[PDB]
């Protein structure tokens, strides 16, 4: 199906304690493949997926240098932004950046994106056309005009439409066992009483890849988000994912409450009733 | 593969 390659960068300042913490992570779909932590031993980009160690010394050499260059911009970004909002030297603040690309099931380019946040809300974003910027406030307006002047989006678009899709494709064929597999969810259902006149029905989905899954509850046709409790999709930690959904039932009526499971690795969408 | 050209804000 669709695939993606995304990189995630967090920088957090440590006043009185030192140079900021920098963490970078690369994903293809929902498989992390590389990392860099500013606090780790090696001070290099490190592998995280089997299929990426067939890249030569050149690759790692290069990726270390680029992630250190990223680290450096973020280091400086934290100080610039502190000046932009006239904040004190004493406070710890947060920069996050995320960029990447989507391809379709022909593997041709689909979407490209580059997002930026300061203290967990949006700062500046590359718009969908990859030519222009959305700025969040007056302080980001400075950054917007600087990035217009320094031709950033030009370089970004060249990467996102080009290199980003060229390397994703390489990665996908390098990790064909790993990445091109889809694992169907192994389903399950439980039941425990809450009161005397009340029951809870819990749909379950285990061991699926990828993480995109829909679980929905419904009585008799018309679907339900009124008693519905969903948990967030959580990793099992072996590379597969898990999720559940619960509803409170006026008990005796657990005949006519049904559960819908939607996932990419399912030939048919699953209808599950409590037997 | 990472982006080659990051610029300050």
């Amino acid at each position, epitope marked *: 199906g669709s695939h993606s390659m995304r990189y995630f960068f967090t920088s957090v300042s440590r006043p009185g304690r030192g140079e900021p913490r920098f963490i970078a992570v690369g994903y293809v779909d929902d498989t992390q493949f590389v990392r860099f932590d500013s606090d780790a031993a090696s001070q290099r980009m490190e592998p995280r997926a089997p299929w990426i160690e067939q890249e030569g010394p*050149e*690759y790692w050499d*290069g990726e270390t*240098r*680029k992630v*250190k*260059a990223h680290s*450096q*911009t973020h280091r*400086v970004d934290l100080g610039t932004l502190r000046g932009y909002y006239n904040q004190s030297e004493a406070g710890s603040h947060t920069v996050q950046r995320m960029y990447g690309c989507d391809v379709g099931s022909d593997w041709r380019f689909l979407r490209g994106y580059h997002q930026y946040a300061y203290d967990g809300k949006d700062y500046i974003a590359l718009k969908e056309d990859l030519r222009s910027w959305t700025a969040a406030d007056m302080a980001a307006q400075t950054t917007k005009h600087k990035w217009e*002047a*320094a*031709h*950033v989006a*030009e*370089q970004l678009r*060249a*990467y996102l*439409e*080009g*290199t980003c899709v*060229e390397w994703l494709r390489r990665y996908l064929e390098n990790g064909k066992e790993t990445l091109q597999r889809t694992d169907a969810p192994k389903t399950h259902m439980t039941h425990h009483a809450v009161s005397d006149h009340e029951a809870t029905l819990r749909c379950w989905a285990l061991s699926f890849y990828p993480a995109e899954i829909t679980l929905t509850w419904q009585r008799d046709g018309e679907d339900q988000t009124q008693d519905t409790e969903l948990v967030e999709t959580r990793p099992a930690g072996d590379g597969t994912f898990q999720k559940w959904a619960a509803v409170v039932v006026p008990s005796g009526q657990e005949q006519r409450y049904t559960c819908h499971v939607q996932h990419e690795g399912l030939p048919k969408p699953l209808t599950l009733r409590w037997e | *593969l*990472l982006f*080659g*050209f*990051p*610029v*300050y804000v």
Partner: T-cell receptor
Amino acid sequence: NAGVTQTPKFQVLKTGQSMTLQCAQDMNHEYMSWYRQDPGMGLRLIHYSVGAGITDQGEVPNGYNVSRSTTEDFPLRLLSAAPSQTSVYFCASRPGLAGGRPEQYFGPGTRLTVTE
Amino acid sequence: KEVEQNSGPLSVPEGAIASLNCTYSDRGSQSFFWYRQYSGKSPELIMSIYSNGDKEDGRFTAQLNKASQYVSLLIRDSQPSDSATYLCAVTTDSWGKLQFGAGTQVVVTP
């Protein structure tokens, strides 16, 4: 803008003399490099500097010394000139992280001859 | 040897097409440059290309094929003042050094 300026255009030295070659850049670039060019070898990197205050060597750094005390100025100096330094020296500059349109622009050059 | 260039010297008459080739060896290269350098003076930037396909700028046309690791330069409609040596340059990032070819010397005969 003036771009990259270099000084001087031509020079002679005898074996043992010292000489500094000036270089300047107008564009708030962080990344500056010194090269030499020779008839058999093409461009070879001598030293280079990816920000103010900081510098590191390249493939041919022996006998040349470099310092980058400001963003704008990157002087190369030779302390004991030798006849293997008879060459053409070019300065070059590149934006670094400051304004990333990735092209590197060279200076006009210093043509240099050292004789016994 | 990282950047491999067209051997030279390359002689074409005036009005002709001067085609220049260049292959490189680092796959993760992301920026690509043609330089002009007349004898006696300094390398002058004439063409920058960033992604696969053709960039046209007056008489110059640079093309790029990242997949076969090849950059080219066409000089359409040649003046005799196009006689120089033409340098191929390749980089991977802001902080990765610019890799230079040896140069192809191009003579435009009248």
